Amino acid sequence: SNNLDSKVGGNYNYLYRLFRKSNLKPFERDISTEIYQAGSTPCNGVEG
Amino acid sequence: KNKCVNFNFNGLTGTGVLTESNKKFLPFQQFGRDIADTTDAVRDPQTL
Amino acid sequence: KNIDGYFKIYSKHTPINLVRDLPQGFSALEPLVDLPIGINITRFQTLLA
């Protein structure tokens, strides 16, 4: 859909999850906007 | 009815003879299966 | 119950003559409707008149 969805300058409306604390089960929609950690290091709010 | 014909009721494929039996289908029961878990009786979707 | 997002609802209405806790008997419940909501349910409440 390059001629339909994309636009000049970049269409940044579509999002995706880079990682989670663990792998999710199949057929499961998750719309949570919480910051998830990659490892065991507790972050508690801010990014890093 | 009373003829060996191929049936197909919403994917319920098979071959048999159609007739009216004493099966008392409940309002929610769509179609019945025999001891072999094979469709032995169905309900007409168009007119009940 | 909520199986694969398909919320099942069963119902059964029958008369009784009860003067104590839940009757000690048996009665098969039939399905009323199926609501494919597609969400995870963890809590519930009920309404009273």
What residues have CB less than 8 Å from C26, skipping those under 6 apart?
none
CB contact under 8 A, C31 and B28: yes
B34 touches chain C (CB under 8 A): no
CA A20 to chain centre: 8
Looking at chain B, which residue has its C-alpha nearest residue C29?
A: B28
H/E stretch holding B33: strand B32-33
Query: For residue B39, with 0-12 CB atoms within 10 Å meaning exposed, 13-18 middle and 19 or more buried, which class applies?
Result: middle
* Closest of C33, C4, B30 to residue A29, by C-alpha: C4
Q: Is B26 on the interface with C (CB under 8 A)?
A: yes
Q: How far apart are CA B24 and CA B36, in angstroms?
A: 19
> What approach was used to elucidate this structure?
cryo-EM
- What count of Cα atoms within 13 Å lies in the side-chain half-sphere of residue A43? 11
CA pair distance A14, A8, nearest whole angstrom: 15
CA distance to partner chain B, nearest, from residue C15 (Å)? 20
Q: Token match 């409306």: residue?
A: A13
Q: Are residues B18 and B3 in contact, defined by beta-carbon separation less than 8 angstroms?
A: yes
Q: Which residue of C has its CA nearest to B26?
A: C30
| Cα–Cα distance measured from residue B30 to residue B11, given in angstroms and rounded to the nearest whole number | 13
SS3 of C2-25: EECCEEEEEECCCCCCCCCCCCCC
In the block, residue with structure tokens 């119950």: C1
Q: Cβ distance B31 to B42 under 8 Å?
A: yes
What is the residue-wise DSSP string for A1-48?
Answer: -TTTT--TT-----------SSPPPSS------PPPPSSS----SS--
Phi-psi region of B25 (alpha: psi -120 to 50; beta: other; left: phi over 0): beta
Q: Phi then psi for C35, rounded to 5 degrees?
A: -105, 95
The tokens describing A14, both together, are: 């579509």
CB-CB contact of C12 with C30 (8 Å)? yes
Q: Which of residues 13-32 of C touch B (CB under 8 A)?
A: 30-31
The first and second tokens of residue A35, run together, are 């910051």
Q: B28: nearest CA in chain C?
A: C31
How distant is the Cα of C29 from the closest Cα of chain B, in angstroms?
12
Give the burial string for C23-46 (b: 16+ CB within 10 Å, else e). eeeeeeeeeeeeeeeeeeeeeeee
